[PDB]
Amino acid sequence: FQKKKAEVCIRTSQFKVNKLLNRKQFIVEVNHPHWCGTVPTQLIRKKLATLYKVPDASQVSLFGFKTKFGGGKTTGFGLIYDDLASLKRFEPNYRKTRMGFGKARLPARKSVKERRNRNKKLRGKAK
Amino acid sequence: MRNYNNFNRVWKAPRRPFEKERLDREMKLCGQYGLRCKREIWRVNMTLSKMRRTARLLLTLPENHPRRLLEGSAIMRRCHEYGFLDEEKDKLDYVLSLTVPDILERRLQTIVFKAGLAKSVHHARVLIQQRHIAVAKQIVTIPSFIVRVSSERHIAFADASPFGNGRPGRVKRVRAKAAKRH
Amino acid sequence: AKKHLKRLYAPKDWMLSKLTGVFAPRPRPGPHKLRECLPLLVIIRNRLKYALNAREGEMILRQGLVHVDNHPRRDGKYPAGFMDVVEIPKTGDRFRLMYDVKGRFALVSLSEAEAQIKLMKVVNLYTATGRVPVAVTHDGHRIRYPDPHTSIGDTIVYNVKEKKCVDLIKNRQGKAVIVTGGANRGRIGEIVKVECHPGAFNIAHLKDASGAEFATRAANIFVIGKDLNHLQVTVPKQQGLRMNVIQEREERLIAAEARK
RNA sequence: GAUCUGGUUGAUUCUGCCAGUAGUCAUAUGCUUGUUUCAAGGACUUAGCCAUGCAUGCCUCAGAAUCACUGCAGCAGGA
RNA sequence: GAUUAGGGUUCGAUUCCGGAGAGGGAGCCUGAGAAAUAGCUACCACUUCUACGGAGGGCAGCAGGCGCGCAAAUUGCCCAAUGUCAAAACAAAACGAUGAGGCAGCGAAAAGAAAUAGAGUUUUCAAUGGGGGAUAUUUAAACCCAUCCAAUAUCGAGUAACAAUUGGAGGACAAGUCUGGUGCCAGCACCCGCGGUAAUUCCAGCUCCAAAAGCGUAUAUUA
RNA sequence: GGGCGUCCGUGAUUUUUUACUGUGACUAAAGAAGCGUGACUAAAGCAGUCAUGACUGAAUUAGAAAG
Ligand SMILES: [Mg+2]
Ligand SMILES: [Mg+2]
Ligand SMILES: [Mg+2]
Ligand SMILES: [Mg+2]
Ligand SMILES: [Mg+2]
Numbered sequence: 001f002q003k004k005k006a007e008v009c010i011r012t013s014q015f016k017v018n019k020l021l022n023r024k025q026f027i028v029e030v031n032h033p034h035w036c037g038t039v040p041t042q043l044i045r046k047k048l049a050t051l052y053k054v055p056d057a058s059q060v061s062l063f064g065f066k067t068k069f070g071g072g073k074t075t076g077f078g079l080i081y082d083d084l085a086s087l088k089r090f091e092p093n094y095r096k097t098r099m100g101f102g103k104a105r106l107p108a109r110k111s112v113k114e115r116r117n118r119n120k121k122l123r124g125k126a127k
Numbered sequence: 128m129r130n131y132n133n134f135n136r137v138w139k140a141p142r143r144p145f146e147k148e149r150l151d152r153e154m155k156l157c158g159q160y161g162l163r164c165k166r167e168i169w170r171v172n173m174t175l176s177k178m179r180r181t182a183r184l185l186l187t188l189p190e191n192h193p194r195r196l197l198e199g200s201a202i203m204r205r206c207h208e209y210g211f212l213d214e215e216k217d218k219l220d221y222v223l224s225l226t227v228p229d230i231l232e233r234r235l236q237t238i239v240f241k242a243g244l245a246k247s248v249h250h251a252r253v254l255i256q257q258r259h260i261a262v263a264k265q266i267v268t269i270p271s272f273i274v275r276v277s278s279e280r281h282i283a284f285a286d287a288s289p290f291g292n293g294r295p296g297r298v299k300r301v302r303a304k305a306a307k308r309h
Numbered sequence: 310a311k312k313h314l315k316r317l318y319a320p321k322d323w324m325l326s327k328l329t330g331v332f333a334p335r336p337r338p339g340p341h342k343l344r345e346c347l348p349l350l351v352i353i354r355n356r357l358k359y360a361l362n363a364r365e366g367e368m369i370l371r372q373g374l375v376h377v378d379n380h381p382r383r384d385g386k387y388p389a390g391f392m393d394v395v396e397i398p399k400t401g402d403r404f405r406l407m408y409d410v411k412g413r414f415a416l417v418s419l420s421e422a423e424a425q426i427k428l429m430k431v432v433n434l435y436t437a438t439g440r441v442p443v444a445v446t447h448d449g450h451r452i453r454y455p456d457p458h459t460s461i462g463d464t465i466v467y468n469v470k471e472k473k474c475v476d477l478i479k480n481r482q483g484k485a486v487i488v489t490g491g492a493n494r495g496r497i498g499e500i501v502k503v504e505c506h507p508g509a510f511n512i513a514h515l516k517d518a519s520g521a522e523f524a525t526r527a528a529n530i531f532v533i534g535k536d537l538n539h540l541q542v543t544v545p546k547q548q549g550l551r552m553n554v555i556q557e558r559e560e561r562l563i564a565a566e567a568r569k
Numbered sequence: 570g571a572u573c574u575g576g577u578u579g580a581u582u583c584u585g586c587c588a589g590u591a592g593u594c595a596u597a598u599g600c601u602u603g604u605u606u607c608a609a610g611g612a613c614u615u616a617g618c619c620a621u622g623c624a625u626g627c628c629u630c631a632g633a634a635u636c637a638c639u640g641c642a643g644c645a646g647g648a
Numbered sequence: 649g650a651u652u653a654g655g656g657u658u659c660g661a662u663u664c665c666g667g668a669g670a671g672g673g674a675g676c677c678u679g680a681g682a683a684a685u686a687g688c689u690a691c692c693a694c695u696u697c698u699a700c701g702g703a704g705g706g707c708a709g710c711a712g713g714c715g716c717g718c719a720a721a722u723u724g725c726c727c728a729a730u731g732u733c734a735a736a737a738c739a740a741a742a743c744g745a746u747g748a749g750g751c752a753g754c755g756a757a758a759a760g761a762a763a764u765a766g767a768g769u770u771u772u773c774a775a776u777g778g779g780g781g782a783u784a785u786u787u788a789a790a791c792c793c794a795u796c797c798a799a800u801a802u803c804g805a806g807u808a809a810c811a812a813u814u815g816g817a818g819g820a821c822a823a824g825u826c827u828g829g830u831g832c833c834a835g836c837a838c839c840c841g842c843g844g845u846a847a848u849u850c851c852a853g854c855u856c857c858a859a860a861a862g863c864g865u866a867u868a869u870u871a
Numbered sequence: 872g873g874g875c876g877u878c879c880g881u882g883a884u885u886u887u888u889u890a891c892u893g894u895g896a897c898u899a900a901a902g903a904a905g906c907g908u909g910a911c912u913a914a915a916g917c918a919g920u921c922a923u924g925a926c927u928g929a930a931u932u933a934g935a936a937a938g
């Protein structure tokens with residue numbers, strides 16, 4: 001054993017440019033020996049930003065990772081769009097909400113179900 | 128309810144549960160290979176029984192038949208791959224001569240005893256299950272892991288284990304905390 | 310009126326995994342049969358990975374970005390089947406639906422000149438109102454004034470841009486077919502002898518390029534050229550030649566060992 | 570694995586059943602249960618009876634807006 | 649599906665396909681398609697609100713409730729995925745509906761993998777889970793699992809008390825001519841048989857055997 | 872300009888089936904058999920594997936009688 005600062009190196013396996021939806025899609029595997037815990041998605045986002053030279057580091061989209069048994073590495077899917085305005089357009093709301101910017105959650109669906117059943121009786125401008 | 132994930136049984140209990148000849152052989156096999164229960168022997172029975180049954184069907188089939196050239200070269204391939212048969216044994220009549228200790232020698236509990244990484248076969252089963260042995264820089268925590276022939280070269284201590292190049296384990300580390308408060 | 314497919318009752322050539330959801334996209338009526346098509350949601354999501362789910366998949370289709378036979382198809386459930394030409398102008402790739410020799414659908418990449426024509430087999434002939442004799446095709450087309458030598462078993466070359474039947478291929482002894490049904494589906498062969506048996510199914514005997522003899526029903530054969538060299542359309546990478554199951558099993562082990 | 574074994578007699582050969590035995594994605598029950606993975610789950614009796622909530626609704630650039638609705642300075646959202 | 653050398657013998661309410669039904673029984677309208685039932689009309693059997701004039705009900709949908717039984721869970725979260733519908737791509741003041749379907753809670757039905765220790769000279773040395781937790785990761789959101797006890801800097805086994813049980817020890821059938829008690833009693837025993845004051849069989853203590861996170865028993869059913 | 876011999880459809884001429892058996896043609900998945908593949912092993916699953924993208928894989932076989 002020899003103590004050194006825990007280094008993250010990052011690798012992209014099967015890369016694809018998607019001219020539809022305006023993005024570059026791929027799976028990204030992170031090797032993190034001597035790391036403590038799991039690498040955060042935010043820290044993978046900036047290091048994948050430098051490797052592809054994207055102008056804004058927040059236009060990278062990184063969702064579900066699966067850490068390998070035994071440790072040492074993770075592997076998840078990656079998305080980098082041509083524009084950040086294209087990111088807010090084509091990403092789902094749940095991946096936007098995990099990036100901060102996104103629509104706040106609707107009222108609980110059990111409430112909107114009951115109100116809509118109450119309005120089935122009415123006719124005028126009351127509903 | 129609409130779930131189509133499959134599952135079957137891997138072992139079978141013997142007919143005649145009290146045979147004094149059988150009960151003596153299986154206590155030797157639990158001692159010479161460090162086994163938890165008789166059920167780990169009984170799946171090695173069913174693993175080898177299924178090989179002994181398919182290879183006995185293929186000998187009913189003639190040579191230069193399609194189901195014997197294909198799928199008879201598959202069962203000789205997995206014996207050579209997992210160390211069940213050495214490379215001279217290529218005639219398919221040697222699968223009918225395989226024994227239960229021929230399969231039990233290929234478990235990761237046995238090779239870690241035979242390669243020399245542990246003093247006893249009960250030392251090997253502890254060190255597998257306590258995350259010390261990596262087969263191909265892959266920490267394997269399963270004692271019934273059947274080691275291939277090509278995997279024998281690369282069994283070593285894990286790179287994250289305290290016995291390898293990892294951080295020191297619990298009894299040193301909780302002692303290193305007690306010497307720190309003083 | 311069925312509106313649902315279960316993913317187990319879906320065709321096996323689509324290759325949808327049984328553990329991902331109960332349902333499969335039931336293809337609408339249209340050109341091709343439900344048992345014998347590949348709907349555009351499976352092509353855009355499962356064949357091509359342009360879409361990760363069905364929600365990204367209708368962002369492509371409803372926007373008007375996939376063209377099946379020169380016309381944009383905004384339906385994820387549109388039945389695309391055999392001999393169809395799927396263009397995409399943005400990614401600049403265009404494909405043809407062919408059967409490969411294992412019977413599955415295969416996307417054969419095309420040029421611009423090869424992507425204008427398609428080959429279509431007559432299924433019925435009748436006279437419409439007026440005295441116009443129209444030809445009914447397996448892709449649902451109704452060509453109104455076909456070549457007067459058109460019979461039912463024949464093949465019309467069509468050119469989907471300028472909707473003009475440019476050619477005809479008769480169904481005779483000396484022609485080469487592709488088999489589009491049965492155990493022999495995807496195989497290409499010369500025609501040897503066609504056994505008539507009126508009142509029942511015509512049987513067609515066929516010989517392959519290697520010399521392998523095999524038979525089908527003559528409603529399953531689809532004539533695609535004058536001979537096996539002069540095929541009118543390009544075929545997948547095996548070119549209708551079915552290798553042995555032992556020999557093709559040996560070659561993958563040899564290729565996997567030689568790769569490492 | 571194309572396998573049986575106790576029980577009729579003072580002992581012996583049989584016939585023949587009872588009994589053991591091993592399965593069940595076959596149910597129920599009893600005593601126990603530290604970790605994980607994968608799962609069935611009011612079918613059987615009563616297609617018996619049902620409190621309450623919910624389970625089928627749809628709007629785009631592209632059918633109909635004078636809300637006495639909303640911003641904005643007629644254009645947009647629209648119940 | 650279960651079992652099966654071969655021939656067979658059984659089970660199939662249940663996920664896929666088809667048929668039928670929506671409390672029983674009819675009869676219809678509308679529509680391309682219904683003899684539709686989270687459509688209508690009527691009667692029969694039950695049934696809820698009423699200001700007595702009247703008005704309604706249909707869980708063999710999903711949760712639940714009472715009964716019935718030997719016998720079967722949450723009045724849970726969500727459309728993120730799979731799909732269906734449709735005037736409908738996503739986004740922009742600007743999120744279509746879905747008890748279909750997922751997800752989680754209960755869950756020893758049945759299946760996989762697997763701890764309860766190792767190593768050495770009375771006496772020490774190492775281990776790492778169960779379990780606590782995170783810069784976090786998963787996830788629609790959590791959960792789980794996976795990864796981690798510094799990366800400058802993360803808690804922890806000793807009777808490891810963090811403690812294995814369930815059935816047996818005459819025979820079949822593996823394993824006591826051990827000790828105490830009772831005395832054809834109490835009980836055991838699938839069958840044969842035990843027990844009548846020295847019980848290989850009961851009630852117990854010890855010690856063993858078998859399977860083991862399992863193991864008895866009962867009823868079906870195959871060998 | 873004759874012979875030879877085919878193809879297709881139509882007329883006229885006096886009749887032999889069935890079981891069996893060999894080959895075919897058609898015959899949904901899930902399930903069974905099994906070919907690949909270190910999901911850590913396995914029960915699984917159809918996936919993945921390798922140094923601004925490459926070779927892609929999902930092989931195959933049994934499935935009652937009748938037609
Ligand atoms: Mg560790
Ligand atoms: Mg049904
Ligand atoms: Mg009645
Ligand atoms: Mg219910
Ligand atoms: Mg005594």
Ligand SMILES: [Mg+2]
């Ligand atoms: Mg006793």
